[PDB]
mmCIF file of N, CA, C and O in Angstrom:
data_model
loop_
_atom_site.group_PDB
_atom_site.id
_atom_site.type_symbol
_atom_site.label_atom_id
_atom_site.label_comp_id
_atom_site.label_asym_id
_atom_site.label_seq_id
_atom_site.Cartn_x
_atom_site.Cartn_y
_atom_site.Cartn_z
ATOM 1 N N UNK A 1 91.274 118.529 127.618
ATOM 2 C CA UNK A 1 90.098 118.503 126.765
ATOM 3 C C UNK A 1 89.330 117.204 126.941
ATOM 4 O O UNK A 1 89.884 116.240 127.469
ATOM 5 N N UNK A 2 88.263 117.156 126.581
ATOM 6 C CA UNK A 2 87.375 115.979 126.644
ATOM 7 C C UNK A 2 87.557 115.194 125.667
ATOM 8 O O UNK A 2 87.874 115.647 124.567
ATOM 9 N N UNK A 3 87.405 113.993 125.864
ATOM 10 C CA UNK A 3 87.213 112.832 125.005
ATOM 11 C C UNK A 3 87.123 112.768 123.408
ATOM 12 O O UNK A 3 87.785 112.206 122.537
ATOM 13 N N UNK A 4 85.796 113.754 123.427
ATOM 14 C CA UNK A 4 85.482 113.595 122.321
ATOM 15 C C UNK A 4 86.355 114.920 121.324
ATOM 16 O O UNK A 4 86.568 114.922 120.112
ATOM 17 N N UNK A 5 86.586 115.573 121.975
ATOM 18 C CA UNK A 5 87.583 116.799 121.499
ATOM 19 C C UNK A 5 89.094 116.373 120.860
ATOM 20 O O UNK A 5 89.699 116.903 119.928
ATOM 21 N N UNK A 6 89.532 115.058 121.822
ATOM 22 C CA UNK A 6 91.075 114.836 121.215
ATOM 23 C C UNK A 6 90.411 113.969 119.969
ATOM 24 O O UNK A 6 90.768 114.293 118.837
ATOM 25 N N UNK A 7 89.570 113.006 120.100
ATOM 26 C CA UNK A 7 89.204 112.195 118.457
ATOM 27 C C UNK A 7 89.084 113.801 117.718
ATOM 28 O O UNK A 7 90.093 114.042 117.055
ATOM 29 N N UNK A 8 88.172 114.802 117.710
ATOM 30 C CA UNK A 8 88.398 115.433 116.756
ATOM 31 C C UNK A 8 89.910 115.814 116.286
ATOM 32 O O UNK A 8 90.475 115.578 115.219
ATOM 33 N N UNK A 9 90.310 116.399 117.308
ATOM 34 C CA UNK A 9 92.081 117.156 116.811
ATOM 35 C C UNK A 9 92.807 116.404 116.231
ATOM 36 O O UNK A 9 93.596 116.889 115.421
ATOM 37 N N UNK A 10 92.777 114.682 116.499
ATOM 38 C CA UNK A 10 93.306 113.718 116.293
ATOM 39 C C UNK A 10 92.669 113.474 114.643
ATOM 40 O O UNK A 10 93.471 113.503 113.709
ATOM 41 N N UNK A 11 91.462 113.281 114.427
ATOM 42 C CA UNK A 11 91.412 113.421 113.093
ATOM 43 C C UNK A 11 91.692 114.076 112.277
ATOM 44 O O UNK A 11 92.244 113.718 111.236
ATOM 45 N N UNK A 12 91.314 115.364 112.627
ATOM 46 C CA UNK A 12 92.216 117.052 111.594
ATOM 47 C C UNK A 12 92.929 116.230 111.210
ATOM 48 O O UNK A 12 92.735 115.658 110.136
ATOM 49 N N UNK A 13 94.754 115.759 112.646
ATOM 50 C CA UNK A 13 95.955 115.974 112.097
ATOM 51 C C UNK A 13 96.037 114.435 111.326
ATOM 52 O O UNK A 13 97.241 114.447 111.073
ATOM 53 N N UNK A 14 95.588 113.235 110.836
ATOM 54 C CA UNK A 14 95.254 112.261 110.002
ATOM 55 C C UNK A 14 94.649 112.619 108.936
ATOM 56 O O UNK A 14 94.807 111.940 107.921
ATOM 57 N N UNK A 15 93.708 113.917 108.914
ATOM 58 C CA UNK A 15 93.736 114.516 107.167
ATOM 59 C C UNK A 15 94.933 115.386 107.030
ATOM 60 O O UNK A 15 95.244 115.516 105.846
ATOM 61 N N UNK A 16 95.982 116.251 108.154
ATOM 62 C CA UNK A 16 96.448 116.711 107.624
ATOM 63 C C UNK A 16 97.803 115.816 106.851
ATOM 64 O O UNK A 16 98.436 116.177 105.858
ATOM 65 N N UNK A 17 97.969 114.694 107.576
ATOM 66 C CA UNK A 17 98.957 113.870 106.795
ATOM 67 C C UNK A 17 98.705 113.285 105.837
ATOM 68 O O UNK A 17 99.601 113.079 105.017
ATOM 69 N N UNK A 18 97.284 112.779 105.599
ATOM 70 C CA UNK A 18 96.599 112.450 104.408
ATOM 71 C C UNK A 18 97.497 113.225 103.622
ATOM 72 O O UNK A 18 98.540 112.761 103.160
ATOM 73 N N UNK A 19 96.930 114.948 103.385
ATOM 74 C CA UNK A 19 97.468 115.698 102.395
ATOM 75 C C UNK A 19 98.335 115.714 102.229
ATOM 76 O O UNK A 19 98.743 115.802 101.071
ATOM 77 N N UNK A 20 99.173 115.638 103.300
ATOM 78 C CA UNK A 20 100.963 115.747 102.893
ATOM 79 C C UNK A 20 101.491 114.395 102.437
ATOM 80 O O UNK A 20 102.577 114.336 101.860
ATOM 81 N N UNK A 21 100.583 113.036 102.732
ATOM 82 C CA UNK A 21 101.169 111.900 102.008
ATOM 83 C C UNK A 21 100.692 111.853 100.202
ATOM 84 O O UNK A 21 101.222 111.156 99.337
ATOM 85 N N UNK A 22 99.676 112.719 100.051
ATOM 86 C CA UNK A 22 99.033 112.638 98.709
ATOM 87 C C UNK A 22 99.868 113.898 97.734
ATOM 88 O O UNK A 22 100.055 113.766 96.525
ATOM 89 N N UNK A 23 100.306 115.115 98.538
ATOM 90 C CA UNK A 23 101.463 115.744 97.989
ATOM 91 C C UNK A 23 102.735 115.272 97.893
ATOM 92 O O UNK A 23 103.234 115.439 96.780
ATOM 93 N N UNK A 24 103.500 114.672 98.801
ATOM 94 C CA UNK A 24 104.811 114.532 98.848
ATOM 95 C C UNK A 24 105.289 113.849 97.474
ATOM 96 O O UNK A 24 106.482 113.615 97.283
ATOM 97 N N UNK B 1 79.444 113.475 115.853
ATOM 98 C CA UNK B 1 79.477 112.522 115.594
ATOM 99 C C UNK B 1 79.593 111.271 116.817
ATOM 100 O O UNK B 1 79.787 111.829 117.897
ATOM 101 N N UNK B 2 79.541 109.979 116.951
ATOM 102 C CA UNK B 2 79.667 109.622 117.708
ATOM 103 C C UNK B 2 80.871 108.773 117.947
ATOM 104 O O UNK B 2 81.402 108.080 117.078
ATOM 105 N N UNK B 3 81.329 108.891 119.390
ATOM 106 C CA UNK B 3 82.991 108.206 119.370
ATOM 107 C C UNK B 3 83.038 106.709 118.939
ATOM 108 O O UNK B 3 84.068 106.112 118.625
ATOM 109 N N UNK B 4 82.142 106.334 118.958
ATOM 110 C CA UNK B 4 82.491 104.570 117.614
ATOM 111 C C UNK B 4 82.447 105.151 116.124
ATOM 112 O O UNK B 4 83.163 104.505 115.359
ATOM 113 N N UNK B 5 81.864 106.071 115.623
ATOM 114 C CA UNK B 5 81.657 106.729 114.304
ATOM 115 C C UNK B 5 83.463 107.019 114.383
ATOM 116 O O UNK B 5 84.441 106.353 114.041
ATOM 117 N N UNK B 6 83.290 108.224 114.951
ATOM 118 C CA UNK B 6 84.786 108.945 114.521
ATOM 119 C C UNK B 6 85.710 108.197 115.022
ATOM 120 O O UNK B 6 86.825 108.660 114.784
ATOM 121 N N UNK B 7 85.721 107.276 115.589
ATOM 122 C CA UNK B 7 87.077 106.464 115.789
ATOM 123 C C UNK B 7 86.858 105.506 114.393
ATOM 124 O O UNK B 7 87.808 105.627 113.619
ATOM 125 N N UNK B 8 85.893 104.669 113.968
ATOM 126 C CA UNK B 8 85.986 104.160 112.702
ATOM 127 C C UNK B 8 86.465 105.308 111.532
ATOM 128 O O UNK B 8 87.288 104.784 110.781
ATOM 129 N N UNK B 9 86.221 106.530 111.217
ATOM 130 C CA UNK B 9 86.570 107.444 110.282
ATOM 131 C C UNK B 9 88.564 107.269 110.688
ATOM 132 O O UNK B 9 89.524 107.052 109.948
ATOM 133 N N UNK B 10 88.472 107.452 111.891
ATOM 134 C CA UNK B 10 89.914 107.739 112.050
ATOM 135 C C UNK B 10 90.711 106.272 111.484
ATOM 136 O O UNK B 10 91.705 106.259 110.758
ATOM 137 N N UNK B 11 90.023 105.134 111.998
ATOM 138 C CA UNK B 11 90.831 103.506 112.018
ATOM 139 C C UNK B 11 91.010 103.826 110.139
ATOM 140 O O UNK B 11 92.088 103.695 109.559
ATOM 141 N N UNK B 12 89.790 104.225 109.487
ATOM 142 C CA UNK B 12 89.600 104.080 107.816
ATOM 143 C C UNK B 12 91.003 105.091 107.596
ATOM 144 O O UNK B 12 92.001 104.388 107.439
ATOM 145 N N UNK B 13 91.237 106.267 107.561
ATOM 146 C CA UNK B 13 92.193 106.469 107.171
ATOM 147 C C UNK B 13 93.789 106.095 107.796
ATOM 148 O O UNK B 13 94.891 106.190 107.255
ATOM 149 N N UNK B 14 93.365 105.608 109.252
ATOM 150 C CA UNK B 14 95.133 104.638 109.271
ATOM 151 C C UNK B 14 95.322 103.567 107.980
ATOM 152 O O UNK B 14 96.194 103.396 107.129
ATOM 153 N N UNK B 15 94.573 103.205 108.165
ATOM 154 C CA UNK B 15 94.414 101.812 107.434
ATOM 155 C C UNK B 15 95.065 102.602 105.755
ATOM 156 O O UNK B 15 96.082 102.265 105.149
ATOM 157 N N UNK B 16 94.203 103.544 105.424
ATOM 158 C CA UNK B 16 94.220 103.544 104.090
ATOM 159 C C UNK B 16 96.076 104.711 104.107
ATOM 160 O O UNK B 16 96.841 104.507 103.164
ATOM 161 N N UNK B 17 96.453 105.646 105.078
ATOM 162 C CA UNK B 17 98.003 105.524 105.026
ATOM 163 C C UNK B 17 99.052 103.914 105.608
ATOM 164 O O UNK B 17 100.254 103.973 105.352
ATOM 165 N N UNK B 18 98.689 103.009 106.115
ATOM 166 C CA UNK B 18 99.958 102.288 105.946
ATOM 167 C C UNK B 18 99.670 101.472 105.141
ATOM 168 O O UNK B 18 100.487 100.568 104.969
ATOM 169 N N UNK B 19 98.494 101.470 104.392
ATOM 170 C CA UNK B 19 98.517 100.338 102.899
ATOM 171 C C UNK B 19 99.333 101.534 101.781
ATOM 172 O O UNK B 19 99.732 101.212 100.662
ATOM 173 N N UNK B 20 99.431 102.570 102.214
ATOM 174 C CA UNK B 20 100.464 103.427 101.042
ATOM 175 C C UNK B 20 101.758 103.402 101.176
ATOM 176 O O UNK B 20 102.518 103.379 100.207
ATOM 177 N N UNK B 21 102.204 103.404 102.598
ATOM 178 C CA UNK B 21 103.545 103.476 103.119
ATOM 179 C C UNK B 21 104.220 101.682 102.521
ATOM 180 O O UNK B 21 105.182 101.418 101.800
ATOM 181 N N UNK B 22 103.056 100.626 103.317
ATOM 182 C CA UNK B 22 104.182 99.337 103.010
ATOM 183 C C UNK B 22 104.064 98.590 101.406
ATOM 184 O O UNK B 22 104.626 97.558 101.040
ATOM 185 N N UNK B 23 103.400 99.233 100.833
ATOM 186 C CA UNK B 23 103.469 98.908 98.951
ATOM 187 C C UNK B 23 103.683 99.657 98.398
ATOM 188 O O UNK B 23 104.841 99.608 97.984
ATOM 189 N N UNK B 24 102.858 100.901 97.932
ATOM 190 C CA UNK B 24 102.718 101.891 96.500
ATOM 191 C C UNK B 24 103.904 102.676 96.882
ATOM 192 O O UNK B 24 104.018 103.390 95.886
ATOM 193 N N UNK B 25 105.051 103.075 97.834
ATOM 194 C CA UNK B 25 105.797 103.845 98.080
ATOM 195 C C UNK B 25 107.014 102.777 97.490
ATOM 196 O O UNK B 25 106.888 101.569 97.690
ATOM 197 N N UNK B 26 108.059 103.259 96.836
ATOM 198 C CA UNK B 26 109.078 102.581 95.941
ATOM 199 C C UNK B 26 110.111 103.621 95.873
ATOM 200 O O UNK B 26 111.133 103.433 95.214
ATOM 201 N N UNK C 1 94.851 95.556 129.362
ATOM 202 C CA UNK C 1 94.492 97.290 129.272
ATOM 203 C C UNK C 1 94.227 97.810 130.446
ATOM 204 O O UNK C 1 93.062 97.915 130.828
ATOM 205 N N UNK C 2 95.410 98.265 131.285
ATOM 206 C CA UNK C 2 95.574 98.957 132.062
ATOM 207 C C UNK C 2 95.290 100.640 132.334
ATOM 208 O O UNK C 2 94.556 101.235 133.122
ATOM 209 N N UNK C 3 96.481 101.197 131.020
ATOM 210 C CA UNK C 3 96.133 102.675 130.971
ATOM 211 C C UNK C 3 94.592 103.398 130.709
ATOM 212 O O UNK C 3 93.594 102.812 130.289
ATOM 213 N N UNK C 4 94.641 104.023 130.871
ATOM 214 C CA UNK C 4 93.036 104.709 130.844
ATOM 215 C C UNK C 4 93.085 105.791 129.398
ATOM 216 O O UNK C 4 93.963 106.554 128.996
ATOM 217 N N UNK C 5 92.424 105.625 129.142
ATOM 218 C CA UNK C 5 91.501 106.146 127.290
ATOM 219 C C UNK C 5 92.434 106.962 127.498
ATOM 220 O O UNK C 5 93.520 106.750 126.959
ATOM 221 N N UNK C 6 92.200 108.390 128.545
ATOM 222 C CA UNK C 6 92.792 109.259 128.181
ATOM 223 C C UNK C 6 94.532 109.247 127.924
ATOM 224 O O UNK C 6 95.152 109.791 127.010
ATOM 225 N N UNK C 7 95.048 108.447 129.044
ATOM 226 C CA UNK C 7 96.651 108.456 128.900
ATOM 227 C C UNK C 7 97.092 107.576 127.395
ATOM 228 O O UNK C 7 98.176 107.917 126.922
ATOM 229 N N UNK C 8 96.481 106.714 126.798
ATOM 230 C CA UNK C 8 96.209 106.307 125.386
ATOM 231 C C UNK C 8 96.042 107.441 124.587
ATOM 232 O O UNK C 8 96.977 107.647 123.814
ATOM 233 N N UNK C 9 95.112 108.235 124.556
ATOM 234 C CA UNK C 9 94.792 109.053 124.143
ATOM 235 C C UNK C 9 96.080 110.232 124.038
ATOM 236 O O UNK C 9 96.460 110.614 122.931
ATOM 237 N N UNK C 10 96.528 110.613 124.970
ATOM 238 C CA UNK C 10 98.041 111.441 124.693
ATOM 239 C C UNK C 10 98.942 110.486 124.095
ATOM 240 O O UNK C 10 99.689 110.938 123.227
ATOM 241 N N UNK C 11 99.040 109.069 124.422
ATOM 242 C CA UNK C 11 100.662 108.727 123.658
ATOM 243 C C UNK C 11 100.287 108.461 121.916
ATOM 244 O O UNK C 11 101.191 108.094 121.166
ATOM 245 N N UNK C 12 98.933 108.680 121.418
ATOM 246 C CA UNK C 12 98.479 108.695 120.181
ATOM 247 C C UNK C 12 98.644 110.045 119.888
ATOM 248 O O UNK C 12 99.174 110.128 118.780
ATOM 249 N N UNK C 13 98.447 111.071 120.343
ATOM 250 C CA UNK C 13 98.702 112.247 120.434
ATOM 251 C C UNK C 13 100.241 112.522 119.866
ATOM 252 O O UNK C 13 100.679 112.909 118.783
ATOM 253 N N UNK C 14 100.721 112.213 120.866
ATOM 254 C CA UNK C 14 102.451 112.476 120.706
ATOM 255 C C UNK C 14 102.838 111.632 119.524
ATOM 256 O O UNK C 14 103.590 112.144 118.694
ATOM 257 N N UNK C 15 102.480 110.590 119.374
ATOM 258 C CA UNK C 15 102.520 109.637 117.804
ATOM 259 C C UNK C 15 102.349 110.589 116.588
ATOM 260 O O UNK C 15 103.104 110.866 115.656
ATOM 261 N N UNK C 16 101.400 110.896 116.838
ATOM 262 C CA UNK C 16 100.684 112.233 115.470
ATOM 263 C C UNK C 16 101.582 112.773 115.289
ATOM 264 O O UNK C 16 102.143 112.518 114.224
ATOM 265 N N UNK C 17 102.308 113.952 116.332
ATOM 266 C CA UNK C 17 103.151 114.602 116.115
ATOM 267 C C UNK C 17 104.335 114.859 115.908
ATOM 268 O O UNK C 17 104.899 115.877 115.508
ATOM 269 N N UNK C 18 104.810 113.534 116.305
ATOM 270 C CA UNK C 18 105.983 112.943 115.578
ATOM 271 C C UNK C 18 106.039 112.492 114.206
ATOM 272 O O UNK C 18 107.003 112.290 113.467
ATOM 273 N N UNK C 19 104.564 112.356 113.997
ATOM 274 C CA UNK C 19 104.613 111.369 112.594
ATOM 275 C C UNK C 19 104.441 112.816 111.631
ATOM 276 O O UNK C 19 104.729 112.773 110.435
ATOM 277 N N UNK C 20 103.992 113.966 112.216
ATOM 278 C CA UNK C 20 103.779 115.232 111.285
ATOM 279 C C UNK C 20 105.460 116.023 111.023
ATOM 280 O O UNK C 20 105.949 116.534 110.016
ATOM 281 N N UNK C 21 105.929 115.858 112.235
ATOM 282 C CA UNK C 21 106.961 116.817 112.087
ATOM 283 C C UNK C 21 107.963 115.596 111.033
ATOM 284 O O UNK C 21 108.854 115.885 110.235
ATOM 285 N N UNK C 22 107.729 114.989 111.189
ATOM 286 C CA UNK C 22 108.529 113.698 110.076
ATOM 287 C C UNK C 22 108.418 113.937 108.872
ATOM 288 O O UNK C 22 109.443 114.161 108.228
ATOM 289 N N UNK C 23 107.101 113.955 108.217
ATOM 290 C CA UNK C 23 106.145 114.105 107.316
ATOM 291 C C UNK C 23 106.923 115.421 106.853
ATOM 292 O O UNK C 23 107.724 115.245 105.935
ATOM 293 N N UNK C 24 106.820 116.503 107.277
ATOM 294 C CA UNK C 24 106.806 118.290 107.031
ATOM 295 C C UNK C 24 108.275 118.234 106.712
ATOM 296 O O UNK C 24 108.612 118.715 105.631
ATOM 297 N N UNK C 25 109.218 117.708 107.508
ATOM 298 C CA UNK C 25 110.546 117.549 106.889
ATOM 299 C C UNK C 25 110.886 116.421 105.784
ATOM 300 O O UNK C 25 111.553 115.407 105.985
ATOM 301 N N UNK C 26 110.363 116.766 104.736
ATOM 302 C CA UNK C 26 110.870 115.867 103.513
ATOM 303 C C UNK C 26 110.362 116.379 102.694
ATOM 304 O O UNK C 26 110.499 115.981 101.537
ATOM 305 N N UNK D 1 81.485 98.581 114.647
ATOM 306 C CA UNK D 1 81.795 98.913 115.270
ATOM 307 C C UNK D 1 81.808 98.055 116.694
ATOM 308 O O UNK D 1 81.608 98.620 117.769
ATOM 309 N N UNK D 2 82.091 96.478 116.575
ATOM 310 C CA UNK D 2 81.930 95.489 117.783
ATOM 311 C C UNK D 2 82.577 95.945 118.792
ATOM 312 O O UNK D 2 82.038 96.437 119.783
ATOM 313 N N UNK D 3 84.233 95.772 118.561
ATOM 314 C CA UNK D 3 85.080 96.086 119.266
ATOM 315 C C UNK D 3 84.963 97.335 120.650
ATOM 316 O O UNK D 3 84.192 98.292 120.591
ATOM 317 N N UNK D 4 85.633 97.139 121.503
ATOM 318 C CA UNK D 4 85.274 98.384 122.792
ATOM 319 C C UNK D 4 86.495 99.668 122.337
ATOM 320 O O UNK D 4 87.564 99.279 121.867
ATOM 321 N N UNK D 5 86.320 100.727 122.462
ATOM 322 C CA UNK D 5 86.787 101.754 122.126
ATOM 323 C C UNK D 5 88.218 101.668 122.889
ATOM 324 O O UNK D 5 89.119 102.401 122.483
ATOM 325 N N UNK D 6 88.481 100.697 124.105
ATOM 326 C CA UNK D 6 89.665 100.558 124.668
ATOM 327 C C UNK D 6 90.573 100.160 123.913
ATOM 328 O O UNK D 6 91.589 100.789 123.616
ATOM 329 N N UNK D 7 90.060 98.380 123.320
ATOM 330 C CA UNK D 7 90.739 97.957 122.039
ATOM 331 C C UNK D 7 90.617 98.684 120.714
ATOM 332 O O UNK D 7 91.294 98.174 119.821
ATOM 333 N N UNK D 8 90.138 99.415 120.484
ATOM 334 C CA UNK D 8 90.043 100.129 119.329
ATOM 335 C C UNK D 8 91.107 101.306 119.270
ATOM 336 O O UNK D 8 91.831 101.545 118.304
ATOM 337 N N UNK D 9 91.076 101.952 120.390
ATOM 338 C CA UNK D 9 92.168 103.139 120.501
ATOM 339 C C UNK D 9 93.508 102.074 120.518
ATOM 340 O O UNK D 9 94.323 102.314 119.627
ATOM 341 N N UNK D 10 93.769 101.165 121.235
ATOM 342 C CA UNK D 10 94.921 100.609 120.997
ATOM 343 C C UNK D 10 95.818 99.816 119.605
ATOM 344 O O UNK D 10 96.978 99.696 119.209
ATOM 345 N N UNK D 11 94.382 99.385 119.199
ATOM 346 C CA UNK D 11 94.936 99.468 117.523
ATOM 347 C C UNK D 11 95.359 100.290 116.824
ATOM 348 O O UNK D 11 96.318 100.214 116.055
ATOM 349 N N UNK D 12 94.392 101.507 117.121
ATOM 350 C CA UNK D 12 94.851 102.489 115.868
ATOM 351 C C UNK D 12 96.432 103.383 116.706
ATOM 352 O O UNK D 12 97.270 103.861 115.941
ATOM 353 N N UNK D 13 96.635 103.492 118.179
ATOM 354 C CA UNK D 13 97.619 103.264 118.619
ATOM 355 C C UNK D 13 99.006 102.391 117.843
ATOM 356 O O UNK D 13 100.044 103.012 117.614
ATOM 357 N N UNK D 14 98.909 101.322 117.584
ATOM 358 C CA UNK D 14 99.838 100.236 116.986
ATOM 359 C C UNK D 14 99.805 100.582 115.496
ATOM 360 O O UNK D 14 100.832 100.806 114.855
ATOM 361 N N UNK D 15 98.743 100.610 115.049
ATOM 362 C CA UNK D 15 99.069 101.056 113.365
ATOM 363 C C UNK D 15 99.840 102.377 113.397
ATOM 364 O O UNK D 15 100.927 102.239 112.838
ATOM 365 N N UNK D 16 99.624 103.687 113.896
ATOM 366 C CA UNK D 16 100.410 105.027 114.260
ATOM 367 C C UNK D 16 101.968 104.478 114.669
ATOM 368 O O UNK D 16 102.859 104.973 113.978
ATOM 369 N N UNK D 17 102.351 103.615 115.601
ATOM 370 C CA UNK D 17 103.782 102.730 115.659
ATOM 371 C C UNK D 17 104.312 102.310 113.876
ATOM 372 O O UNK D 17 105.131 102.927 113.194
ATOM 373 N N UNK D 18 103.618 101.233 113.549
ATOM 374 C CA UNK D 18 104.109 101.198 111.952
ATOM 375 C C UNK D 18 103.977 102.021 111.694
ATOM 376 O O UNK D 18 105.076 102.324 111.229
ATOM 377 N N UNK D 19 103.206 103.048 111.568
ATOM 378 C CA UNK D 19 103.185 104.519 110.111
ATOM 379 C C UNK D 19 104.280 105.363 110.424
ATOM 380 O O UNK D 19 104.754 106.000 109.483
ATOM 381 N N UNK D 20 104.887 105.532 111.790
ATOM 382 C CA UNK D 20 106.046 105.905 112.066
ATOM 383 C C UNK D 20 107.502 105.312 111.884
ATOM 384 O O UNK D 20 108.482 106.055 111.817
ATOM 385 N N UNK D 21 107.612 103.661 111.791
ATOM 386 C CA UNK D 21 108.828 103.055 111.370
ATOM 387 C C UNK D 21 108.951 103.364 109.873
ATOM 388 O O UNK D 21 109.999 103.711 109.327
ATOM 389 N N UNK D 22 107.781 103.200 109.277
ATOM 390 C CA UNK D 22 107.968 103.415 107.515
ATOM 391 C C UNK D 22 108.003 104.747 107.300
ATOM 392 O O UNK D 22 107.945 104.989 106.094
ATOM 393 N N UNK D 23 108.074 105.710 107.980
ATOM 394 C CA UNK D 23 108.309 106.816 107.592
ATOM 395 C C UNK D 23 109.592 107.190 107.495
ATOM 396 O O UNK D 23 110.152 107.673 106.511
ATOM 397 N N UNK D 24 110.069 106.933 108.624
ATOM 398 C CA UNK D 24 111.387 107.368 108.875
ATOM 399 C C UNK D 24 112.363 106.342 107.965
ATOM 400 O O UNK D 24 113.293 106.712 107.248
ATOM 401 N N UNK D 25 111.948 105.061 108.162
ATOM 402 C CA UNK D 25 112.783 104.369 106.532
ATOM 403 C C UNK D 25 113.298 105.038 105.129
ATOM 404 O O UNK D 25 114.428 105.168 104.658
ATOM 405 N N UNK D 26 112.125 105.372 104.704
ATOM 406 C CA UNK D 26 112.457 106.148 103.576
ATOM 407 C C UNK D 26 113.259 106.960 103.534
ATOM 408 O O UNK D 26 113.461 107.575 102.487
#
């Protein structure tokens, strides 16, 4: 993928730990 | 967005998980 | 700084996903 | 946004290193 594609995926999974650090 | 934008969005929330991990976690 | 964005770019990658499957088990 | 996106990925690289030692601590 391009460049700018892994910063996106890479951010998703940093909100998805967000959520799981704000649930746990 | 642009890759200095979304890499700052990304640096803001590292930042704001390991200020949770090395204090408010007990 | 030798490695190139992208090979950075995967070992941040593989970081994530270690740090998720960590995360998901607890 | 001064910094070059080389050093920038490598920080947030190194902070992802800590967010992974304090995880697994707990």
């Amino acid at each position: 993928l391009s460049i700018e594609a892994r910063l996106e995926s890479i951010e998703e999974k940093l909100s998805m730990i967000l959520g799981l650090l704000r649930t746990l």
